[PDB]
Ligand binder design. Structure first.
Ligand SMILES: *[C@@H]1O[C@H](CO)[C@@H](O[C@@H]2O[C@H](CO)[C@@H](O)[C@H](O)[C@H]2NC(C)=O)[C@H](O)[C@H]1NC(C)=O
Ligand SMILES: *[C@@H]1O[C@H](CO)[C@@H](O)[C@H](O)[C@H]1NC(C)=O
Ligand SMILES: *[C@@H]1O[C@H](CO)[C@@H](O)[C@H](O)[C@H]1NC(C)=O
Ligand SMILES: *[C@@H]1O[C@H](CO)[C@@H](O)[C@H](O)[C@H]1NC(C)=O
Ligand SMILES: *[C@@H]1O[C@H](CO)[C@@H](O)[C@H](O)[C@H]1NC(C)=O
Ligand SMILES: *[C@@H]1O[C@H](CO)[C@@H](O)[C@H](O)[C@H]1NC(C)=O
Ligand SMILES: *[C@@H]1O[C@H](CO)[C@@H](O)[C@H](O)[C@H]1NC(C)=O
Ligand SMILES: *[C@@H]1O[C@H](CO)[C@@H](O)[C@H](O)[C@H]1NC(C)=O
Ligand SMILES: *[C@@H]1O[C@H](CO)[C@@H](O)[C@H](O)[C@H]1NC(C)=O
Ligand SMILES: *[C@@H]1O[C@H](CO)[C@@H](O)[C@H](O)[C@H]1NC(C)=O
Ligand SMILES: *[C@@H]1O[C@H](CO)[C@@H](O)[C@H](O)[C@H]1NC(C)=O
Ligand SMILES: *[C@@H]1O[C@H](CO)[C@@H](O)[C@H](O)[C@H]1NC(C)=O
Ligand SMILES: *[C@@H]1O[C@H](CO)[C@@H](O)[C@H](O)[C@H]1NC(C)=O
Ligand SMILES: *[C@@H]1O[C@H](CO)[C@@H](O)[C@H](O)[C@H]1NC(C)=O
Ligand SMILES: *[C@@H]1O[C@H](CO)[C@@H](O)[C@H](O)[C@H]1NC(C)=O
Ligand SMILES: *[C@@H]1O[C@H](CO)[C@@H](O)[C@H](O)[C@H]1NC(C)=O
Lengths: 44, 189, 50, 241, 195, 145
């Protein structure tokens, strides 16, 4: 049993994507107590 | 401190800032700016029971909240600050009021069976048929009124010989404990 | 989480509190704004003898 | 005690010529209250630092809370194995022609909205108990004893059997033992008139049953007023509670 | 299960006793080697004392729980010895002590950390209604049965054993006389037989 | 603070376990009383009431049970002159049930717990040997039908 800053299960992830429409997503976001960043792609 | 704050009136003395209780916890505090007597209630609600079948039967549970009245459940659980998977278990159409608080997540039937999961105050719960948790008044047994008259008797004409099995524990395991090896094995200091 | 196992069995279990956690922090001090005279308690011409 | 030297001789015996039928009250505890303890609330409720420090003490609360639930299940088992001897609830007979015996104070009455007997009502009134969540939340200006132990994780659990179900069980047992003798405790219930059951029991204690019928009405009086003495043993400032 | 949980109550206490060794008890670590390798003699004593106090309290808790369980097991063993003495070695008239019904015999068998009894008992099966009377007024004197009761199938009266239907004719060796036949409530009129 | 409160909780749980063991012993006794006295008739002395136990009536109570044990006690004893046996005509006569008593002139057979004097008849007695080995045997006549 460990207390810590964890990502809660089924938490509200905000999602951004790069699709050319013709939009890139490089906004500025709050870094509160650490973040979880998951990226899916094809060509890095 | 940590808790929830409610407006109340405990009538503090003029030269007073906080009021204790019999457990030496801050029962109430005075607002230093508005001069208002606040009231501190603990955030936790120990007194919640989870009624479940086996883990390899269903991921479905019922929640029993003890000695509460079901309209003030969301202000006793503070359901606004919970995840929505909790907030579905605070209100709903499956609320059943018992004498042991009330139960959310199990439908109440008017039938009576022998019960598997005892809940309390005569209410039991089971996992029946799709599949859902049901709650019901426990059945004491089969109703059977015996005939009686001042000149009538009942005498057996045939008998049965039965064998009943009774299991009694006699002994348990015998253990011995080495203090030195348990507390600190191989240490002269 | 309170029974310390991943598989709970059939029954009713009492439960320790884990659901609700505080988010905000409230600080409330008396409305006094006078800076304290540390320029006279400290940095005086003469102190008293011990 | 009282000094009393009994006479004795090698050719003298003492034989009773009259008898008395007595009713003796015996009170036995069956169960105790079921309590549950939340360690976080008791040790440090709503404090993440002390909770983190309490995590470094191990299984001293899983072991602590396992014993109390075993006690609670044991109390439910105690009540079940005392009262639920027979699973066939026998209804109270509608006519009380029990040879002159008057089972009014011990049989239930439907008029009083508790479904308990007279003596059970006296016993419930004599025992003085020593709450709802929401009464503690309100402004009461002085924290209750129960509300202080409810905010610290020391909750008390209700029994599995209510007083109505236990009264139903005792009513079924009493109806079976006044309408069937001892036969309902061994197999199916076998009807028998109450005078014949008393003849059976006098044969059990060692006297012939002919002394029953010839004194039967008298015996009924020696039963009935005895039940009245129980009232004098319970309503007039009893200490047997 | 009534035996099995007993084993599950003794294999679990030892496992918790082992798992309580991985507890800080307020010390910097739960390992004696880390404290004795990181701190000198004066500074590690206050940590080893915390570990010693915690482990001693854990051992005392285990011993107290084992004493409670030993008292309960000894009560059950006393009950089992009483049941062996009073039902296997004889026959008990105590109701519901050995089986449901009138106890006939019992056979003991062993089990892992326990005993099991096969109580073989007698129960009535097929009851029948009958019309009964407490006594018979033959010629002014009441007749009471020695063993059994008077029953009637509608026309004739018979003596019967109270636990099995064995109808026998009314004969003066089955009954004894006591006084006049007017003081008994519910006495019926019939004739007895004298050989 | 944690150590003190944990020790306090452990003390409370230990006392509760002790009291639960005592209450379980009392509940086992109450179940035995219910089985052996309400559901039947017990010949054990002073198990259910003071005297010869006739019936028991159970009633409920807050966290407990109460038994009304209705029992039989003798009321008015009387003195009598007794003998172990009767020599009728050279052979002893022992009673089947009851004892031989006398009010001064005649001898009667009586039930052991109630005064029901009956005339000496050969169906109340059985013969065994001759009347020279029994100590205290008296002389009388045994009537026969
Ligand atoms: C049985 O005894 C009682 C006690 O005297 C008789 O009186 C009744 O007592 C109950 C209290 O339990 C009252 O509720 C009734 O109203 C009383 N009835 C009367 C007529 O006084 C009772 O009558 C007796 N029963 C019988 C059948 O004789
Ligand atoms: C996540 O946050 C956005 C913010 O507006 C909200 O619209 C959305 O409903 C949230 N998702 C869930 C599942 O609550
Ligand atoms: C201090 O400030 C609060 C709000 O910031 C104000 O309401 C109050 O009147 C002020 N003065 C006091 C508390 O003397
Ligand atoms: C509390 O429950 C009772 C039922 O016993 C009900 O009558 C009452 O209205 C409830 N209180 C509320 C809803 O505030
Ligand atoms: C169950 O019983 C309640 C009690 O009044 C009743 O209102 C309800 O209609 C019943 N449900 C049925 C019979 O399905
Ligand atoms: C008694 O019951 C047994 C089975 O329980 C049966 O085989 C037998 O025929 C019955 N006898 C009578 C006389 O009914
Ligand atoms: C102390 O106060 C005087 C004025 O009273 C000031 O000139 C000086 O800079 C202060 N600080 C010192 C002496 O370190
Ligand atoms: C026996 O005693 C009762 C009261 O105890 C009395 O009413 C009755 O008359 C007595 N009978 C005899 C024969 O002495
Ligand atoms: C005796 O007769 C009654 C009524 O006719 C009936 O209800 C009962 O089942 C019969 N048999 C018994 C008591 O064994
Ligand atoms: C009752 O038993 C007698 C005795 O054998 C028999 O003759 C008679 O037919 C039976 N039935 C009735 C209705 O009397
Ligand atoms: C038995 O009870 C009935 C009830 O109707 C009654 O008519 C009959 O006289 C009673 N028999 C007696 C008291 O011997
Ligand atoms: C039985 O005998 C008595 C006494 O002679 C008499 O009063 C009674 O009526 C008789 N029984 C019947 C059914 O005639
Ligand atoms: C029997 O005789 C003895 C001897 O005098 C006497 O004390 C006693 O009162 C008599 N009566 C009894 C025992 O009822
Ligand atoms: C003893 O009993 C006989 C039996 O009838 C009686 O005649 C006699 O008067 C009684 N008393 C004495 C002193 O014999
Ligand atoms: C009883 O004891 C007396 C002495 O008190 C004696 O005279 C008498 O013979 C004894 N009766 C016997 C031995 O039958
Ligand atoms: C009774 O008989 C025996 C043997 O004949 C005799 O010795 C004895 O004296 C007789 N009893 C009396 C009182 O005469």
């Amino acid at each position: 049993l460990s207390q810590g800053y964890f990502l809660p299960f089924y938490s509200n992830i905000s999602w951004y994507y790069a699709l050319t429409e013709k939009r890139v997503d490089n906004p500025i976001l709050d870094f509160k107590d650490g973040i979880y960043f998951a990226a899916t792609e094809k060509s890095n | 401190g940590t808790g929830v704050l409610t407006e109340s009136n405990k009538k503090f003395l003029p030269f007073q800032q906080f009021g204790r209780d019999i457990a030496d916890t801050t029962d109430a505090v005075r607002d230093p700016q508005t001069l208002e007597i606040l009231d501190i209630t603990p955030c936790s609600f120990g007194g919640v029971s989870v009624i479940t079948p086996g883990t390899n039967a269903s991921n479905q549970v019922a929640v029993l909240y003890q000695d509460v009245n079901c309209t003030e459940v969301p202000v006793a659980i503070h359901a606004d600050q919970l995840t929505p998977t909790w907030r579905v278990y605070s209100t709903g159409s499956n609320v059943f009021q018992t004498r042991a608080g009330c139960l959310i997540g199990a439908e109440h039937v008017n039938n009576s069976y022998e019960c598997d999961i005892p809940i309390g105050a005569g209410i039991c719960a089971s996992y029946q048929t799709s599949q859902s948790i049901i709650a019901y008044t426990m059945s004491l047994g089969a109703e059977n009124s015996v005939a009686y008259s001042n000149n009538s008797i009942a005498i057996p004409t045939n008998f049965t010989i039965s064998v009943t099995t009774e299991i009694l524990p006699v002994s348990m395991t015998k253990t011995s404990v080495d203090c030195t090896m348990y507390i600190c094995g191989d240490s002269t200091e | 989480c309170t029974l310390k196992s991943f598989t709970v069995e059939k029954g009713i279990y009492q439960t320790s509190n884990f659901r609700v956690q505080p988010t905000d922090s409230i600080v409330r001090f008396p409305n006094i704004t006078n800076l304290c005279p540390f320029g006279e308690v400290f940095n005086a011409t003469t102190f008293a003898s011990v | 005690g009282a000094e009393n030297s009994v006479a004795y001789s090698n050719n003298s015996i003492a034989i009773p010529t009259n008898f008395t039928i007595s009713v003796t009250t015996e009170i036995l505890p069956v169960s105790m209250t079921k309590t549950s303890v939340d360690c976080t609330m008791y040790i440090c409720g709503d404090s993440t630092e002390c909770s983190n420090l309490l995590l470094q003490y191990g299984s001293f609360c899983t072991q602590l809370n396992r014993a109390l639930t075993g006690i609670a299940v044991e109390q439910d088992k105690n009540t079940q194995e005392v009262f639920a001897q027979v699973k066939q609830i026998y209804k109270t007979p509608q006519i009380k022609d029990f040879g002159g015996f008057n089972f009014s104070q011990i049989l239930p009455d439907p008029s009083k909205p508790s479904k308990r007997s007279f003596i059970e009502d006296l016993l419930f009134n004599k025992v003085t108990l020593a709450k709802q969540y929401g009464d503690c939340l309100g402004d009461i200006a002085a924290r209750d004893l129960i509300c202080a132990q409810k905010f610290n994780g020391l909750t008390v659990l209700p029994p599995l059997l209510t007083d109505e179900m236990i009264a139903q069980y005792t009513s079924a047992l009493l109806a079976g033992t006044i309408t069937s003798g001892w036969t309902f405790g061994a197999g199916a219930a076998l009807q028998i008139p109450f005078a014949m059951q008393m003849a059976y029991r006098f044969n059990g204690i060692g006297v012939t049953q002919n002394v029953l019928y010839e004194n039967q009405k008298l015996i009924a009086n020696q039963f009935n007023s005895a039940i009245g003495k129980i009232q004098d043993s319970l309503s007039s400032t009893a200490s047997a509670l | 299960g009534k035996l099995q949980d007993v084993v599950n109550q003794n294999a679990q206490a030892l496992n918790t006793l082992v798992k309580q060794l991985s507890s800080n008890f307020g010390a910097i670590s739960s390992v004696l080697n880390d404290i004795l390798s990181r701190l000198d003699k004066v500074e590690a004593e206050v940590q080893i004392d915390r570990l010693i106090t915690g482990r001693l309290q854990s051992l005392q808790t285990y011993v107290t729980q084992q004493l409670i369980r030993a008292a309960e097991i000894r009560a059950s063993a006393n009950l089992a010895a009483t049941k062996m003495s009073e039902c296997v070695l004889g026959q008990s008239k105590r109701v519901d002590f050995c089986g449901k019904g009138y106890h006939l015999m019992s056979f003991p068998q062993s089990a892992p950390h326990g005993v099991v009894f096969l109580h073989v008992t007698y129960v009535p099966a097929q009851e029948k209604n009958f019309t009964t009377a407490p006594a018979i007024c033959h010629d002014g004197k009441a007749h009471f049965p020695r063993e059994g009761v008077f029953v009637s199938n509608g026309t004739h009266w018979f003596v019967t054993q109270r636990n099995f239907y064995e109808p026998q004719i009314i004969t003066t060796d089955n009954t004894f006389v006591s006084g006049n036949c007017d003081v008994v409530i519910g006495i019926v009129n019939n004739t007895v037989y004298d050989p």
